Write a protein that holds these residues in place. Structure first.
Motif, PDB file in Angstrom:
ATOM      1  N   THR A  48     -26.404  19.261  -7.668  1.00 15.08           N
ATOM      2  CA  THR A  48     -27.421  20.290  -8.322  1.00 15.08           C
ATOM      3  C   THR A  48     -28.979  20.100  -7.227  1.00 15.08           C
ATOM      4  O   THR A  48     -29.799  20.929  -7.337  1.00 15.08           O
ATOM      5  N   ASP A  49     -28.869  19.023  -6.364  1.00 17.04           N
ATOM      6  CA  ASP A  49     -29.969  18.800  -5.189  1.00 17.04           C
ATOM      7  C   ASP A  49     -30.337  20.221  -4.667  1.00 17.04           C
ATOM      8  O   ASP A  49     -31.406  20.284  -4.335  1.00 17.04           O
ATOM      9  N   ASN A  50     -29.546  20.902  -4.157  1.00 15.94           N
ATOM     10  CA  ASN A  50     -29.728  22.239  -3.561  1.00 15.94           C
ATOM     11  C   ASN A  50     -30.378  23.196  -4.262  1.00 15.94           C
ATOM     12  O   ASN A  50     -30.889  24.283  -3.629  1.00 15.94           O
ATOM     13  N   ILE A  51     -30.341  23.139  -5.742  1.00 17.17           N
ATOM     14  CA  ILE A  51     -31.278  23.963  -6.512  1.00 17.17           C
ATOM     15  C   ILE A  51     -32.210  23.104  -7.279  1.00 17.17           C
ATOM     16  O   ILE A  51     -32.852  23.752  -8.409  1.00 17.17           O
ATOM     17  N   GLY A  72     -30.992  30.393  -6.980  1.00 13.60           N
ATOM     18  CA  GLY A  72     -29.885  29.815  -6.078  1.00 13.60           C
ATOM     19  C   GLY A  72     -28.862  29.178  -6.737  1.00 13.60           C
ATOM     20  O   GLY A  72     -28.822  29.435  -8.035  1.00 13.60           O
ATOM     21  N   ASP A  73     -27.699  28.777  -6.030  1.00 15.10           N
ATOM     22  CA  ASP A  73     -26.654  28.184  -6.501  1.00 15.10           C
ATOM     23  C   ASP A  73     -26.348  26.702  -5.763  1.00 15.10           C
ATOM     24  O   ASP A  73     -27.127  26.792  -4.510  1.00 15.10           O
ATOM     25  N   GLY A 114     -27.528  27.211  -1.954  1.00 11.79           N
ATOM     26  CA  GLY A 114     -28.947  26.867  -2.021  1.00 11.79           C
ATOM     27  C   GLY A 114     -29.767  28.088  -2.364  1.00 11.79           C
ATOM     28  O   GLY A 114     -29.297  28.704  -3.383  1.00 11.79           O
ATOM     29  N   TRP A 115     -30.861  28.162  -1.871  1.00 10.14           N
ATOM     30  CA  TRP A 115     -31.852  29.147  -2.393  1.00 10.14           C
ATOM     31  C   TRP A 115     -31.278  30.625  -1.938  1.00 10.14           C
ATOM     32  O   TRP A 115     -30.739  30.798  -0.864  1.00 10.14           O
ATOM     33  N   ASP A 116     -31.480  31.715  -3.063  1.00 13.41           N
ATOM     34  CA  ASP A 116     -31.194  33.110  -2.818  1.00 13.41           C
ATOM     35  C   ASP A 116     -32.256  33.578  -1.617  1.00 13.41           C
ATOM     36  O   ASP A 116     -33.393  33.057  -1.464  1.00 13.41           O
ATOM     37  N   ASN A 117     -31.902  34.734  -1.322  1.00 11.66           N
ATOM     38  CA  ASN A 117     -32.775  35.407  -0.324  1.00 11.66           C
ATOM     39  C   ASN A 117     -33.709  36.570  -0.852  1.00 11.66           C
ATOM     40  O   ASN A 117     -34.427  37.316  -0.164  1.00 11.66           O
ATOM     41  N   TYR A 176     -31.896  33.636 -10.899  1.00 11.83           N
ATOM     42  CA  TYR A 176     -31.681  32.796 -11.696  1.00 11.83           C
ATOM     43  C   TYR A 176     -30.866  31.466 -10.956  1.00 11.83           C
ATOM     44  O   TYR A 176     -30.605  31.615  -9.662  1.00 11.83           O
ATOM     45  N   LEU A 177     -31.285  30.299 -11.369  1.00 11.81           N
ATOM     46  CA  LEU A 177     -30.694  29.045 -10.863  1.00 11.81           C
ATOM     47  C   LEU A 177     -29.236  28.933 -11.760  1.00 11.81           C
ATOM     48  O   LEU A 177     -29.425  28.842 -12.829  1.00 11.81           O
TER      49      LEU A 177
END
Ligand code: MG
Length: 811
Positions: free
Chosen positions: A1-4, A35-36, A40-43, A58-59
């Motif tokens: 979950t670090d990525n989000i 992000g997921d 990671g983060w969405d655009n 949404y995360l």
């Protein structure tokens, strides 16, 4: 979950999400990107912020394409500046790749059930169908034990069984429903149902949850011989059983009761039945039971007692329910299906904690929960949401596949605090956490930030003077707001810059409205502004606070009762004095200055008097001192006269004053902002007399050409020439009351003696009579002295003068 895990930055622009998006068309909110765990983060850096959205930002936790749960926190500004809508969305799912649950339906197929039976058949079929339709077919193994009595359903065994199998499986379903399809008949060997259901549950040690659901009308009529028993909480429980059987057949009461090897008395099928249930529970089975239309066991036991016993079969009373009808039976089983389905939720009794940010307050204490997923969360399943002690808490979140809830609340940015910075991001939340289940690690929503922009406010001085003399070049002022004890802004207003300066401040207050500013100037030593009375107004439209300095003043105009114009000579003898007093008693003048009818005297707020000290020449003196006041706020008040001081009436437009013979004096307020008080003072003329001269020779003939000159005391000399007529010649100069005059023949006509006699005339205070002397000696009407005879008829004084020929030495 670090990525989000949302990341934040703090710098000179405040604290905000490092990976952000904005709401289309709004500049004072910033939200955290979605992000997921893989990418990671969405655009998505901008979108509309519509609350009905269930796709953007949404995360997502778990499979990015099929999340265990997804969450969102974002804010949007409303149409009220500083007031923000905040939304928390959480969507659940069904679990994947976890162990199944094992459920054994234990169905009383006794004759006493058959219209009970028919509701069981349909109920069981719908139970299986429900689990299938919720996509949990492969996460529930269901088996069946149906019981009657040896010889009936089950043959010798007294029970039938369908092994544990996936609920979703078509052949498993048929097997269970096919097994329940024969007519229910025979006795009620509930013990064998409980025993064999438990044996089915316990046949492996997979470590799946083990559940038995018992459907019965509640009266066991067959049981095993009870060998040992224990009393536990005042109920008797069998603990050891023989192969012999107690068979009362159509009641629970035994035909031949006995005492067992524990020395306990066995008189019905209950010790055995409760005993077997206890044994199943002790083995780790969860026992649920439905009591279907419990009726009295003949005249042995009331349905209330049976119900009591039924409540001891289950692990707790909570897990026993009654069904009073066919629909109650189907509903119970439907609800068992739902409960099992609920078991596999990714969010179960989940919570959200959401403390409000330091720089915000709640607009109100209303947190609205709604379902917004494709599958509804009913009103009864919706979580609780409450705001208390600076925290929003959401409790009892239960969310399965396609179930999503939205929690809406509102916050206001506090701009009035002494430390507030405009154009500076403040976070709307403290750490905001979903705990999806008991014991699970919490996960973070992304925290939005908000800000209030600065705006430019203009301060302007306006001067309205009675002169157009030099104003000061600068003026110091202080601005304040609503009164806020910390906030101040000094400014220098300058002639050079059209008397205008600016400051910047937050664009709105704690309630999203424009701040109401007030301004006040400081004294400037080099220039006296006590005659200016200030007023002010903030024009929101121009963003300009205007301080208006209005000069106030007094003047008078002088009139005559008769209606004649006054000469410049006449106005020279006139005197008016303006007095100023210390207080509203007007008992002590602080100063007294001359004021003319061409003056406009600027006045500071105070107490004043106006008095004629000397009349214009020709007119009576009216020594009345009129009293008035200019108040601090530029009001005019009339306080009567020195003779009769009153408490002060506001002068509204005009105030008629004391009578002056024919007319009344008045105060009138004039100028465009009531800034000038004008006295109209009337003067009545002094009654007067005319002087005329009749001229003769020494032989009673009228004699033209003799010059006579009238000398007023302080006035101007006038000369006339005698006529050769009885009417004579008048002086144009009026002999007014109180006046002193002299007259003499200044030029005798040619061939006649000059007559140096000095006539003095003193007019009485009335002006209707006069005393006459001639070379110092009193002369009365009718009398003669030194060539002059006096007559006085009304207000006319007549002097008859006799001229003597120059003397000639006669030959
Ligand atoms: Mg029965």
């Amino acid at each position: 979950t670090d990525n989000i895990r949302p990341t934040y930055q703090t710098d000179a622009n405040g604290t905000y999400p490092t990976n952000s998006w904005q709401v289309t068309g709004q500049q004072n909110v910033i939200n955290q990107r979605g992000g997921d765990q893989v990418s990671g983060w969405d655009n998505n850096t901008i979108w509309n912020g519509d609350a009905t959205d269930t796709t953007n930002s949404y995360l997502k936790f778990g499979d990015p394409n099929n999340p265990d749960y997804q969450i969102r926190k974002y804010a949007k500004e409303t149409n009220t500046p500083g007031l923000y809508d905040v939304y928390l969305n959480v969507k659940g799912n069904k679990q994947q790749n976890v162990k199944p649950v094992d459920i054994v339906l234990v169905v009383d197929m006794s004759g006493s059930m058959e219209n009970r039976a028919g509701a069981v058949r349909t109920g069981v079929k719908n139970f299986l169908t429900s689990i299938q339709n919720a996509g949990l077919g492969n996460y529930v193994n269901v088996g069946l034990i149906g019981f009657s009595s040896p010889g009936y359903i089950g043959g010798k065994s007294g029970y039938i069984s369908v092994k544990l199998g996936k609920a979703g499986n078509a052949s498993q379903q048929q097997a269970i429903n096919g097994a329940l399809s024969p007519r229910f008949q025979g006795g009620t060997y509930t013990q064998i149902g409980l025993r064999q259901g438990s044996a089915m549950l316990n046949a492996d040690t997979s470590g799946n949850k083990k559940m038995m659901i018992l459907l019965t009308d509640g009266v066991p009529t067959f049981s095993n011989e009870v060998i040992n028993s224990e009393w536990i909480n005042g109920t008797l429980y069998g603990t050891n059983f023989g192969s012999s059987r107690d068979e009362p057949g159509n009641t629970a009461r035994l035909r031949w009761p006995y005492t067992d090897s524990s020395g306990h008395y066995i008189y019905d099928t209950w010790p055995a039945t409760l005993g077997e249930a206890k044994i199943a529970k002790d083995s780790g089975n969860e026992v649920h039971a439905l009591g279907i239309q419990l009726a009295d066991d003949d005249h042995y036991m009331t349905k209330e007692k049976i119900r009591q016993n039924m409540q001891l079969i289950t692990n707790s009373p909570d897990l026993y329910e009654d069904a009073d009808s066919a629909d109650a039976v189907e509903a119970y089983l439907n609800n068992q299906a739902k409960d099992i389905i609920k078991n596999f939720n990714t969010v179960t009794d989940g919570t959200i904690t959401d403390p409000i940010g330091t720089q915000f307050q709640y607009a109100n204490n209303q947190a609205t929960v709604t379902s917004v997923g494709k599958q509804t969360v009913p009103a009864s399943e919706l979580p609780s949401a409450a705001i208390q002690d600076g925290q929003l808490t959401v409790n009892h979140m239960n969310l399965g596949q396609d179930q999503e809830v939205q929690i809406h609340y509102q916050v206001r940015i506090k701009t009035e605090d002494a430390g507030f910075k405009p154009d500076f991001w403040y976070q709307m939340n403290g750490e905001t956490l979903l705990t999806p289940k008991a014991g699970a690690a919490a996960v973070d929503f992304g925290i939005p930030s908000g800000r209030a922009p600065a705006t430019t406010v203009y301060v302007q001085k306006q001067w309205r003077q009675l002169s157009n003399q030099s104003l000061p070049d600068t003026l110091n002022v202080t601005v304040q707001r609503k009164l806020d004890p910390n906030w101040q802004q000094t400014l220098v207003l300058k002639k050079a810059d059209n008397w205008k300066a600016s400051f910047t401040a937050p664009a709105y207050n704690n309630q999203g409205q424009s701040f109401s500013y007030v301004v006040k100037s400081e004294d400037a030593s080099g220039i006296d502004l006590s005659s200016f009375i200030s007023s002010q107004n903030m024009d929101q439209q121009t963003a300009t606070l205007t301080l208006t300095n209005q000069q106030y003043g007094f003047q008078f105009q002088k009139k005559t009762t008769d209606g004649t114009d006054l000469s410049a000579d006449q106005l020279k003898a006139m005197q008016f004095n303006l007095t100023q007093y210390s207080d509203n008693s007007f008992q002590q003048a602080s100063k007294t200055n001359a004021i003319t009818s061409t003056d406009l005297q600027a006045l500071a707020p105070g107490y004043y008097g106006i008095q004629e000290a000397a009349a214009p020449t020709g007119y009576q003196l009216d020594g009345t001192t009129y009293l008035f006041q200019l108040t601090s706020d530029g009001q005019w008040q009339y306080h009567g006269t020195k003779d009769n001081v009153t408490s002060g009436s506001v002068i509204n437009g005009q105030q008629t004053l004391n009578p002056v013979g024919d007319k009344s004096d008045d105060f009138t307020v004039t100028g465009d902002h009531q800034q000038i008080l004008t006295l109209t003072k009337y003067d009545e003329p002094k009654p007067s007399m005319t002087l005329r001269v009749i001229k003769q020779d020494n032989q009673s003939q009228y004699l033209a050409g003799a010059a006579f000159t009238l000398q007023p005391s302080a006035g101007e000399a006038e000369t006339i020439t005698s006529s050769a007529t009885s009417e004579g010649q008048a002086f144009a100069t009026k002999l007014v009351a109180d006046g002193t005059y002299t007259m003499s023949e200044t030029k005798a006509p040619d061939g006649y003696q000059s007559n140096p006699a000095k006539i003095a005339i003193q007019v009485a205070t009335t002006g209707k009579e006069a005393t006459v002397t001639i070379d110092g000696e009193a002369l009365k009407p009718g009398e003669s002295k030194n060539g002059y005879t006096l007559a006085i008829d009304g207000s006319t004084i007549t002097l008859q003068a006799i001229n003597q020929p120059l003397a000639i030495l006669p030959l």
